[PDB]
């Protein structure tokens, strides 16, 4: 089964947050619970009823014909939680497993048919995943700042201004909020077309239709790969500077043993009348007081938190003296790509990469030495070597469009030169509704 | 009337080509295009001149200005004082600025109210244009054609590039064109008539 | 392909001078390319041949 294939399902929280109010808004019966005694025909009646292909899980193990129905019809089960999910289905073939799943964003547009009540895409979810967890006070801060950027007097907003109790700020956090009539008891009532006006039907995040229209373009811009230049994670490896391409990530060789960094590894120990910062290798448990002579180690380093300077330095010494390949995933950096003529304006000590605060943006520079002319035939030999330690973990030159606009032998292209992608030049046409489109590929 | 829009001519886009040159590379030969073909193809050829080590696509610094609080000096957007720690000063060069910056791109694009008006145009006679440019031009064009790599065809002396761009142009799937075109909206009147460029 | 003529920019040239004994340390080691070289004087090719 393909990762896309299988039984779709989501937690109940996602359901109330996104599916349910929209169900109330289209005036359909609430989708049926699926207990152990649920025939596929009932589920079919419910799916045809709600026009949404969703069924909340109720209780008891689900029988297999229902399971094949949900799988083939791509019906979206909602589950209270993800504990022991397999137990909730009868495993006829025993193929299903708790670890055998594929988590993924699923846009509401792919389940609701009516376009009036859908505004955004997966993009907002992605950008939210980029955000830090936010206190209500922090959220108020972001809001007031966005007002400040846009010259709005946001003062006394979200704030009671009582004569005697003083100012009292309340939360500004109302994600996915709706305008709704309430019973005098103070509890809410489902939006009735009979009383409440149509403008109150669906808030549309409280933006003008036009701002939504533009918001779609903006999400496509933010979620574009070419704008994602905040790279994270570097490989520290002792290597002669060979490959011209900035995007060079050296392969970890054959004999190397991966080792997650942990404090338990490095330790003090007596070793030849000295208190050496010994490393112990988990595959064998052997101790290696000297950075020299250590086994090849692809040491991942998820966090440089408590890592002591003796240890950081000892690791780096292992990278050199013992060809350890360490991969620091904690780092987040911008990467300027230098032409060979501008060289390297900045100079990163090993210590700075092993001690830069988490969450500070590092700024690394990377040569594209492809535009570097051949040495003169009588230029003196270079006795010593040119070595390099910092490497990217991911492709860097993502904004790159064209590379090395120069000839090689007045016809041949230089190896690694890049012509612009064809899409840069398509200028197709407006669609029937007026959307932009690339030109047709095949004639039909 | 309410100023719902912002009339402008020769619009600036969100993305723009940045380019780094290695300045020791220049072709010994010197091209001599006709004045009109230089008026059209020129900003492009001047931008993608020989020795261009790289040609990147950055967000337009000129559009997402500091007035929007963005700082595109390093490759990413960076907006200070949006997502910050409360009760202690935020650190400089904080990574959070990137996410903050993205909001400002999104926000600034959410509220672009620019509405294009035609700028100065030109209607070269076909005889003053080298034939490929005539294939690409559509009777008339804004004087401020910006860069676009398809223009380099039969113009860059960098041969592999010209060969490759010629390939992508002659492929059915892509078709560069420039200036006035037949929109479905043509002849529609709104005090002034609409046209497509 | 061409031989360079204008003087090209070069990586900085660290000059280790290894001795009978020494205490090697790699804290604050350079990360961008450097040309390590072991000897103090190496413009040894001085007899130009017209």
């Amino acid at each position: 089964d393909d990762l896309d294939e299988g039984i779709r399902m989501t937690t109940y929280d996602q359901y109330l947050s996104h599916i349910r109010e929209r169900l109330h808004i289209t005036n359909v019966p609430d989708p049926i619970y699926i207990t152990g005694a649920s025939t596929p025909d009932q589920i079919a009646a419910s799916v045809q009823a709600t026009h949404v292909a969703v069924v909340l899980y109720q209780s008891g193990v689900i029988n297999g014909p229902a399971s094949t129905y949900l799988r083939e019809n791509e019906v979206l089960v909602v589950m209270p939680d993800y504990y022991d999910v397999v137990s909730r289905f009868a495993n006829a073939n025993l193929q299903m497993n708790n670890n055998r799943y594929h988590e993924s964003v699923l846009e509401i547009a792919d389940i609701f048919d009516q376009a009036d009540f859908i505004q955004t895409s997966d993009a907002v979810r992605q950008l939210r995943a980029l955000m830090p967890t936010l206190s209500t006070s922090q959220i108020r801060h972001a809001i007031e700042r966005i007002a400040q950027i846009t010259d709005v007097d946001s003062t006394d907003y979200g704030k009671l201004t009582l004569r005697f109790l003083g100012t009292l700020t309340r939360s500004l956090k109302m994600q996915n909020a709706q305008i709704r009539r309430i019973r005098p008891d103070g509890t809410v009532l489902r939006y009735d077309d009979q009383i409440d006006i149509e403008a109150f039907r669906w808030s549309r995040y409280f933006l003008d239709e036009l701002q939504l229209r533009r918001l779609s373009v903006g999400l496509r811009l933010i979620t574009n790969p070419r704008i994602a230049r905040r790279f994270n994670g570097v490989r520290i490896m002792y290597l002669t500077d060979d490959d011209p391409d900035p995007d060079f990530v050296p392969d970890v060789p054959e004999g190397y043993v991966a080792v997650q960094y942990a404090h338990r590894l490095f330790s003090s120990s007596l070793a030849n009348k000295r208190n050496r910062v010994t490393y112990t290798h988990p595959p064998t448990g052997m101790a290696y007081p000297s950075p020299t002579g250590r086994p090849h180690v692809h040491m991942t380093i998820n966090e440089r938190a408590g890592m002591s300077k003796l240890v950081a330095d000892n690791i780096i010494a292992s990278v050199i003296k013992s060809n350890w390949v360490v991969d620091i995933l904690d780092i987040e950096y911008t990467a300027e790509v230098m032409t060979p003529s501008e060289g390297y304006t900045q100079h990163v000590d090993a210590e700075s990469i092993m001690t830069a605060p988490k969450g500070k943006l590092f700024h690394l520079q990377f040569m594209d030495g492809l535009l570097r002319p051949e040495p003169s035939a009588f230029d003196p030999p270079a006795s010593g070597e040119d070595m390099r330690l910092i490497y990217p973990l991911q492709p860097i030159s993502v904004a790159r469009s064209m590379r090395a606009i120069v000839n090689h032998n007045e016809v041949d292209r230089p190896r690694g030169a890049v012509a612009p992608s064809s899409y840069e030049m398509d200028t197709g046409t407006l669609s029937r509704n007026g959307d932009l489109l690339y030109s047709p590929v095949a004639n039909g | 009337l309410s100023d719902d829009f912002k009339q402008i001519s020769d619009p600036k886009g969100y993305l723009t080509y940045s380019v780094k040159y290695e300045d020791q590379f220049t072709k010994k030969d010197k091209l001599r295009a006709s004045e009109a073909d230089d008026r059209i193809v020129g900003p492009t050829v001047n931008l993608f001149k020989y020795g261009a080590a790289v040609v990147n696509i950055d967000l337009n610094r000129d559009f997402f200005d500091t007035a929007t609080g963005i700082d595109l000096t390093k490759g990413i957007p960076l907006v200070q004082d949006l997502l910050v720690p409360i009760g202690v000063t935020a650190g400089a060069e904080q990574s959070a600025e990137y996410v903050s910056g993205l909001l400002m791109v999104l926000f600034k694009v959410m509220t672009d109210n620019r509405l294009v008006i035609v700028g100065e145009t030109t209607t070269p006679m076909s005889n003053t244009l080298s034939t490929v440019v005539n294939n690409v031009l559509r009777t008339t064009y804004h004087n401020n054609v910006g860069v676009n790599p398809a223009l380099l065809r039969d113009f860059t002396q960098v041969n592999w590039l010209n060969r490759d761009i010629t390939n992508m142009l002659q492929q059915a799937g892509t078709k560069y064109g420039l200036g006035l075109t037949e929109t479905r909206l043509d002849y529609v009147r709104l005090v002034k008539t609409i046209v497509g460029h | 392909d061409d031989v360079g003529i204008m003087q090209q920019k070069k990586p900085p040239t660290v000059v280790q001078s290894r001795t009978d004994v020494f205490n090697e340390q790699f804290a604050n080691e350079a990360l961008h390319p450097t040309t390590k070289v072991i000897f103090n004087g190496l413009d040894v090719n001085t007899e130009v041949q017209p």
């Binding site: - | 300045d23 | 003087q7 920019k9």
Partner: peptide
């Protein structure tokens, strides 16, 4: 004579729209 790097990026030329008093058709 030392080699040098350089850079350029296409300029904005977005003027606010002009107010012609001339008309182009009857």
């Amino acid at each position: 004579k030392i080699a040098t790097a350089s850079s350029a990026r296409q300029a904005d030329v977005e003027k606010p729209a002009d107010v012609t008093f001339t008309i182009e058709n009857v």
